[PDB]
Design a protein around this nucleic acid. Structure first.
Ligand code: OIY
Ligand code: OIY
Lengths: 215, 136, 100, 50
RNA sequence: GCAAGACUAAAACUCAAAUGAAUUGACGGGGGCCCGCACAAGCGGUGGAGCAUGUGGUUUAAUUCGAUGCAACGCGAAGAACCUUACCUGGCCUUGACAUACUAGAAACUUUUCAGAGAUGGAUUGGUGCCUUCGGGAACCUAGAUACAGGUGCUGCAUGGCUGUCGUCAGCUCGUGUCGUGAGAUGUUGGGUUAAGUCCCGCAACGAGCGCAACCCUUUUCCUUACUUGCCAGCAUUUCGGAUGGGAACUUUAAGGAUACUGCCAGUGACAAACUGGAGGAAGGCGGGGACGACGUCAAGUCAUCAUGGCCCUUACGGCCAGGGCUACACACGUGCUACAAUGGUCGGUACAAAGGGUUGCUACACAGCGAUGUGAUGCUAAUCUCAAAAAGCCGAUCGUAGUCCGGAUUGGAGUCUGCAACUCGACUCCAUGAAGUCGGAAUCGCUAGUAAUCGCGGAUCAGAAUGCCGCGGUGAAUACGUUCCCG
């Protein structure tokens, strides 16, 4: 059957929201639309910067966007010129001055989004899908993860009939709500259509609850 | 229930006479949660029979219910003690409705008074039951 | 939704915004007791002579992302299909799965 | 949750709005200045009435 | 050889296989075992009537397109008068309502008009703005040019994503050793028990992982912190209204904690897993409910949320407009609402909730009206003001089994409100009218406790438009001997 979203089911348990602001019912819709526009613009602009998480906050009449990236140099620039630009377009998209903060990811192989993007980029270059999945799983397991599951769906290898394949090493306890599961979905566009990639990474259970997550 | 055997529900005695028979009769009379109306009907019937004949309502009701109580049902089968009381109350309910007094309490009091001396429609129903029973 | 429908809604919204003040003034004059019956009748005719798109009953709420005209949820400004996807990945602050 | 037709297949979501009230009496001169100097945490709305 | 036929016995031509044994899975109108509101035992419905709503069919210029056994049919649609709208009739535009790339001119805009059903077209005003290296560049408009835009057009049987279903069914996998020439097998195997591959004994195997359970939310008892907009036990004043001074006790509000573990006592199982009973306790063996859906099945559903390979149209299958249609009506079906009455109808008096909504909004109060409602006015951005009347319930009177003082369909007349506009085609109010219906064939559905039944209240969508959907509380049952039979 169908499976619940691993982050959605944990959003109030051991996971934080990617948006952290307050708004009254009148401003809520406008704020949400501008936040979604910001996310779309950032995702389009920073494809090659290995960007995983975007966190949007509205402290008081201002905006603060924290970008988690594995290549802070490309995001920042040679003298920090590009952060000034990013602030300029983000202030244009929103209606308040925006500050851009950078968060370096020191373990790119434990981030589900980056692994999915790597697999999708490899599939877009006609790399064998079994080899790509095995390489990704091996690298993630070597980086210290407790388990990883990778699934690819579509016209695999150009075949006319679409089918789903998946590969897993370790433990992925999806039914446990206190397990730290990172989940990502990414599509690869090939000349024969679209191949979907899903990645689950398990990093151990989280004890102490949301109170210890420090919400 | 295939494997599990379920215990029978225990009901509280009625607040007035502390009689589970009266409480269960009231439950049979009651429709769609109108226990107040059921209580009015039953207590009115008991008061009516008490003023007609100075006899304890609990004793009169139990004696009449024993009289109407069937040892077998309706195609004959056998029944257990609980089904005996259930069917007795069931048959006692209808005849009061088909009676012709102005209120249900008066109708039920009249039906009980007529069944106690044997000239009751519930008694006729029991007669149909057993004259059906000797068939097998 | 088709791109023409989205542009149609944009045009209607712009017309409603443009004619907002005159319409309010006309309705106030209509509902003004101190004004003469002739003035109220002239105001009624003037209000009936406005373009149809000036009226706000012809605006239809559409999803801010796809333009879908069913299942709107005014609070988020998104149709149900986009609302589910955006909520379940954590982009809507404060919204969680409800159990009770 | 379904794109086309499953009326009994739905997701139920909720959002809660929590409210706190604080009263300060006999404020020292430093009180108002310190409260204004206090930083604004994201996700919390603060309203002050004198 | 009487015959039927028997015996001996080829070739042309044609194919790259035909076979035997064993292995894994799948299937069987093969077997065995168990569970489940599956059947039994009960309570209340549907199929009968009127109306609401969806579908089939028919009709139509159009009655837009999808969903089709269970698992389509109050489904997409959480709300079609215009809009929505995707359909029809007619009127219009063509690099286009929208993007990038090129060449020039213009602040953008703004006031009055006329023709027109409108789309559109023609006149008519005022403004002529911003930054500078100021020799032009930022915005927005206009004109020309072609690559293109556009497509709710087709393919869900080319796809991603998402969802239904079996089904909350209980299974699904891995390592080292052994056995076999081999594909493979073992482990998961039997006896008890459990919601459970849940656990214990047995067992060339020993061990693991995912499934199960728990972690998450809500409810029941108690404690700590907190004392307003919420509360009022004691004191005092009272206009007898927490109204006032006042109090921090109680209710409540809402964060954090405690508690249940077979813990104790009495027997059993087996010498176990387990099972039975009792005290204490708010609660006793999983206390109740929600969320959470394993490996997999159905070329299941969705190209009309969206994205996307391929195919197709390009003065039209694209775009703009007014009117019409999606609301038709000899019929059939599904899901509902209201009744057929006395455990009731009406009238008068009088009690007790929870949850949720409110600033282009909810409205105290007064006046006007029989009423829908209108006018003035007050508080509220809300534990502060408001929607708001809970209803069934209790007391009294009347009606006395009648198609009725039951029922409220249909129709005539007169109005209110939203909206540019209620003819097609809105909701509500008043007067008049007063249909079928007297408990529903074969058959068929839901439900095991605060449940069924019955009574009212709120919200999403939304200008207006719920008998649908999603929630909330009030009153509050009957019956389960058991697994033959029916279904999975
Ligand atoms: C009597 N009504 C007619 C009759 O006997 N006919 C003939 C006749 O005698 C003769 O034949 C001629 N000569 O004409 C014979 C052989 O010659 O066969 C006979 N017939 C036969 N029929 C028989 C058959 O088939 N098998 C077995 C044997 O019985 C055969 N003989
Ligand atoms: N209306 C228009 C629908 C058109 C449809 N789109 C055509 C389509 O998809 N054809 C597919 C396609 O060529 C390919 O399938 C994939 N996946 O590319 C192939 C591989 O099997 O199968 C065909 N389909 C088949 N159906 C058949 C079946 O069952 N038996 C017999 C034979 O006719 C089978 N082939």
């Amino acid at each position: 059957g169908q499976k619940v979203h691993p982050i959605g089911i944990r959003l109030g348990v051991v996971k934080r929201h990617n948006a952290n602001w307050y708004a009254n019912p009148k401003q809520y819709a406008e704020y949400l639309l501008k936040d979604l526009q910001v996310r779309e613009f950032l995702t389009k602009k920073l494809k090659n910067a290995m960007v995983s998480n975007i966190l949007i906050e509205r402290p008081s009449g201002a905006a603060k966007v924290t970008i988690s990236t594995a290549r802070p140099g490309i995001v920042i620039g040679k003298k920090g010129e590009d952060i000034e630009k990013l602030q300029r377009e983000l202030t244009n998209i929103m209606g308040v001055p925006a500050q851009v903060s950078i968060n370096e990811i020191d373990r790119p192989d434990l981030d589900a989004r980056l692994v999915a993007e790597a697999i999708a980029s490899q599939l877009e270059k006609r790399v064998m899908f079994r080899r790509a999945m095995k390489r990704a799983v091996q690298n993630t397991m070597r980086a210290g993860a407790k388990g990883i599951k990778v699934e690819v769906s579509g016209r695999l290898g150009g075949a006319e009939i679409a089918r789903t394949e998946w590969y897993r090493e370790g433990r992925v306890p999806l039914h446990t709500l206190r397990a730290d599961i990172d989940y990502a979905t990414m599509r690869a566009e090939t000349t024969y259509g679209t191949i979907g990639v899903k990645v689950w990474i398990f990093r151990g259970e989280i004890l102490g609850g949301m109170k210890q997550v420090m919400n | 229930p295939r494997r599990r055997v379920v215990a029978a529900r225990e009901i509280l005695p009625d607040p007035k006479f502390s009689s589970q028979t009266i409480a269960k009769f009231m439950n049979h009379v009651m429709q769609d949660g109108k226990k107040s109306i059921a209580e009015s009907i039953v207590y009115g019937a008991l008061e009516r029979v008490q003023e007609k004949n100075k006899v304890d309502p609990v004793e009169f009701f139990e004696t009449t219910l024993e009289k109407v109580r069937p040892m077998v049902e309706v195609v004959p089968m056998e029944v257990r003690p609980s089904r005996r009381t259930a069917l007795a109350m069931r048959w006692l309910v209808d005849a009061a409705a088909k009676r012709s007094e102005k209120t249900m309490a008066l109708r039920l009091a009249g039906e009980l008074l007529d069944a106690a001396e044997g000239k009751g429609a519930a008694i006729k129903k029991r007669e149909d039951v057993h004259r059906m029973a000797e068939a097998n | 939704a088709k791109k023409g429908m989205i542009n149609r809604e944009l045009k209607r919204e712009k017309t409603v915004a443009k004619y907002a003040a005159k319409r309010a003034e006309l309705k106030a004059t209509i509902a003004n007791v101190n004004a003469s019956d002739e003035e109220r009748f002239e105001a009624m005719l003037k209000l009936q002579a406005l373009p149809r798109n000036a009226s706000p009953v012809r605006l239809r709420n559409r999803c801010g992302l796809t333009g879908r005209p069913h299942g709107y949820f005014r609070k988020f400004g998104l149709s149900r299909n986009k609302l589910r996807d955006t909520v379940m990945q954590g982009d809507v602050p404060g919204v969680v799965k409800a159990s009770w | 949750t379904s794109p086309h037709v499953n009326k009994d297949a739905r997701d139920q979501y909720e959002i809660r709005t929590y409210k706190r009230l604080i009263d300060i009496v006999q404020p020292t001169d430093k009180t108002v200045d310190a409260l204004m100097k206090l930083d604004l945490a994201a996700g919390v709305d603060v309203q002050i009435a004198l």
